[PDB]
Design a protein around this nucleic acid. Structure first.
Length: 199
RNA sequence: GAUAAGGAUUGGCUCUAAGGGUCGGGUAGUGAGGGCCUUGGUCACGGCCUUGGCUUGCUACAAUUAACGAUCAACUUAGA
């Protein structure tokens, strides 16, 4: 059908509003076959052509899971996060973060906010600045490259126990021989019982 | 001992945390401060009150590959 209205789990009104303002005029086959399952207690391994709605395909289920598990509430603890997103290059992670910000533009007020933080290797911010504003702003989404997110997670001030969603974009590149050393540690730190999406 | 070698001309892959600290960018206009001047009254070369002409601030165009440069501080042969 490729219609947003007739999907299995009736996407949230603000996510639907963001989709309509952005458009796409419909949902692509990737987003039609991945969103129902990645939010439905199934890990996902997705192969698709470039520019086929993959980024939204793994961003919408992330927000759905964040809202579903009561991550956007006062009950959520400090120095904890919900979802992690990993990409092999800094520009790709920044672009993913921009997409997430665009989706969160239409997030309603009068509720506990949902935020994201980008963790890339930069000369404008040490890892301790990242820890400081992570503690202050309390986001639920982390997006970054393997090196800086590994350094961030290794800091004792950050607790990974509440994470329930890991996404690896360009997962063939992140499981490459060069990247496997860092990603093995990154996944070693995080809890095993989780939902994984490789794209 | 990592990093392709170890008498030779050593410089050696892509992406991915950090790689000692610090400082520094133009040309123009007008306000400010200092410096040399100078002009009157005033008190025995020196004060007092007044008159007209290197640092920094605000605006207007180039540069944003400063992806450069400067300075301070560290360091020596793992071979038997």
């Amino acid at each position: 059908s490729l219609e947003w209205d007739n999907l299995g789990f009736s996407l949230l009104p603000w996510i639907r509003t963001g989709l309509d303002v952005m458009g796409f005029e419909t949902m692509t086959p990737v987003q039609a076959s991945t969103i129902p399952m990645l939010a439905g207690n199934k890990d996902v391994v997705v192969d698709s052509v470039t520019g086929s709605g993959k980024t939204a395909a793994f961003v919408i289920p992330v927000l759905e899971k964040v809202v579903k598990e009561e991550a956007n509430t006062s009950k959520f603890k400090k120095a904890h996060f919900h979802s992690l997103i990993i990409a092999p290059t800094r520009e790709l992670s920044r672009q993913i973060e921009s997409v997430v910000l665009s989706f969160l533009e239409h997030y309603p007020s009068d509720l506990f906010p949902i935020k994201c933080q980008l963790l890339v290797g930069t000369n404008e911010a040490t890892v301790r600045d990242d820890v400081s504003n992570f503690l202050r702003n309390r986001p639920q989404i982390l997006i970054g490259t393997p090196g800086r997110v590994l350094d961030f997670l290794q800091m004792p001030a950050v607790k990974t126990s509440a994470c329930s969603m890991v996404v690896m974009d360009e997962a063939d590149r992140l499981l490459d021989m060069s990247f496997i050393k860092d990603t093995e540690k990154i996944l070693r730190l995080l809890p095993k019982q989780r939902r994984t999406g490789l794209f």
